[PDB]
Structure formats: structure tokens, C-alpha cells
A paper describes a structure:
Type IIB receptor protein tyrosine phosphatases are cell surface transmembrane proteins that engage in cell adhesion via their extracellular domains (ECDs) and cell signaling via their cytoplasmic phosphatase domains. The four human R2B RPTPs ([name], [name], PTPRT, and PTPRU) are type 1 transmembrane proteins and share a common extracellular domain (ECD) architecture of one MAM (meprin/A5/μ), one immunoglobulin (Ig)-like, and four fibronectin (FN) type-III domains, with the most membrane proximal FN domain undergoing furin cleavage in the secretory pathway. Previous studies have shown that [name], [name], and PTPRT form homodimers, but not heterodimers, in cell aggregation assays.
This loop is anchored at one end via a disulfide bond within the FN4 domain (C642 to C716), and the sequence encompasses the furin-cleavage site of [name], illustrating that this site is surface accessible within a conformationally dynamic loop, but that cleavage would not significantly destabilize the fold of the FN4 domain. In both crystal forms, one chain is missing the glycan on N598, indicating that [name]-FN4 not only adopts conformational differences in the furin-cleavage loop but also can undergo heterogeneous glycosylation. Although the previous structure of the [name] ECD had no interpretable electron density for the FN4 domain, it was present in the construct. Superposition of the [name] domains from our structure with this previous [name] structure demonstrates that the FN4 domain can be accommodated without significant steric clashes with surrounding chains, and FN4 colocalizes with weak and disconnected electron density that is unmodeled in the deposited structure.
Author numbering: 481 to 590, 596 to 628, 642 to 723
Write the structure that this text describes.
Amino acid sequence: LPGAVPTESIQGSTFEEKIFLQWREPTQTYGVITLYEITYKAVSSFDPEIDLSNQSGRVSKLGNETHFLFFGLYPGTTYSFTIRASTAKGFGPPATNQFTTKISAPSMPAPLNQTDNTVTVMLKPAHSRGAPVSVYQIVVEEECYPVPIHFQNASLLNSQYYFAAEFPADSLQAAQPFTIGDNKTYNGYWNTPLLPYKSYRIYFQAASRANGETKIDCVQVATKG
Ligand SMILES: *[C@@H]1O[C@H](CO[C@@H]2O[C@@H](C)[C@@H](O)[C@@H](O)[C@@H]2O)[C@@H](O[C@@H]2O[C@H](CO)[C@@H](O[C@@H]3O[C@H](CO)[C@@H](O)[C@H](O)[C@@H]3O)[C@H](O)[C@H]2NC(C)=O)[C@H](O)[C@H]1NC(C)=O
């Protein structure tokens, strides 16, 4: 039977939904390696809403080239990989290492009463894809947005947009109406009344922080003339 794959030769370059797995051949080989068998298994995730009990599988990589690309993984998730080499007589001992996929931006959902100074929209919660949703943001743009800007500074900084509101994701845990321009302050952002002679498009934005990376996505929810 062939030997073990060296554990520290196993190296992975990770993406949101892929891991490129790479190793070296067994230290001693009896015969010729016909295939490698890799077991994969999710060990943990930063995503608060995920089922790990079925995030498992097995691949038989034919040939003896010492790499394989794993598609269909879940973001923000640590997968354990166990590799066995097979000679025509059978499998050698297992080697194991583990790697973590990157987090992706939360899943964005796909007007109610427009007045001279305001617009109200039905906000729908975004869903975690590798990390919780941390904050939602509402962006007002004059005719995504990683740089937050408060209305009071938007003219001096000469920005076409401002952040009208920001909420922690424990607010908006079910669908709720929200009024652009209600003059209230949300997380230090002033939901300034819209100007009745200006035209605006309004965006709903969501962010995930975990593992030191931050990922954001956004969707347009309304226009006002
Ligand atoms: C890793 O795999 C390579 C490629 O071989 C091919 O894939 C394997 C998974 C098996 O299915 C092989 O049957 C298949 O051909 C192996 O390279 C091959 O090594 C053998 C033995 O050294 C070579 O056979 C000899 O080749 C010389 C000419 O170079 C002839 O004169 C001999 O009569 C004899 O046929 C074979 O040619 C070679 N194949 C290629 C394409 O170079 C490699 O040995 C293997 N290594 C391990 C550790 O498994």
C-alpha cells in the first residue's frame, strides 16, 4: 500500500464558493498511484444560519496529478479535507488539513407613498451568505456605496449621494416600511427631507463583517422626480 500524503504539503487557496486544493505525492509509493480520494466536511461557519450536518462529500480524483478544485462550497465556512492515495492494490493512510472560504455579500431582496419631500418603501431583510448581516444602509443619490457620507457634509465633499439611515440588522428582522426624509436620525445619519425640485434614486444596502473582511451589496428601491 502507498504511504501518507505529507500533511503540511496540503495547501489551499480559498475563494467565496471554491477552494483550490494542492498537495504532494506520498513520501514513499508502492506501485503507481491510480487516484486520490478526498473527503470534505464543513467544520464551522461564520454564517449564523447554515446547516453543516450535510455539508460533506467525497471525491475520487483519477490520475496522480496532486491538485483538485472544489466548487459549490458555502461562503465563510471552514471545510476539513482528508486525502488518501490509491495504488491499484488500494488506499494508503489518510492525511488531513482544513481551509476556510471567504465571506460573500448578503443576499439582497428584489413605492408606497411619495410626497413632495418624502418617499416611503417596503424594506425587506437581506440574508446571510457566509456571515451575518451587520448593518443596513439607505443611500440617497441625486440625478454600491462603500464610503458613507452624512448629509451635512455632502455639499462640502461634493458627493452625488448621502447616507440617509443606517440600522443594525436586529432592526428590520421582518419586512417593515421606511420613509425616506422623515427627518429622524438613524445611527448618527440624518434622514434629511428630500428637496421637492430635485430628482433622486434611492438604494437599500446591506453589509457583512467577519474574519476582518467586509462585503456589501445594494439594490435600488425607488426613484423620485
Ligand atoms: C503518475 O502518472 C504518470 C502518467 O501515467 C498515466 O497515468 C497513471 C495514473 C497510470 O494510469 C499510467 O498507466 C498512465 O500511463 C506516470 O507516468 C508513466 O510512468 C510509467 C512507468 O514509469 C511509464 O511507463 C514506461 O514508459 C516508458 C517510456 O517513458 C516505456 O519505455 C516503458 O516501456 C513503460 O511503458 C509511462 O510511460 C509514463 N507515462 C507518461 C505519460 O509519461 C507516472 O509514473 C505516475 N507516477 C506515480 C507515482 O503514480
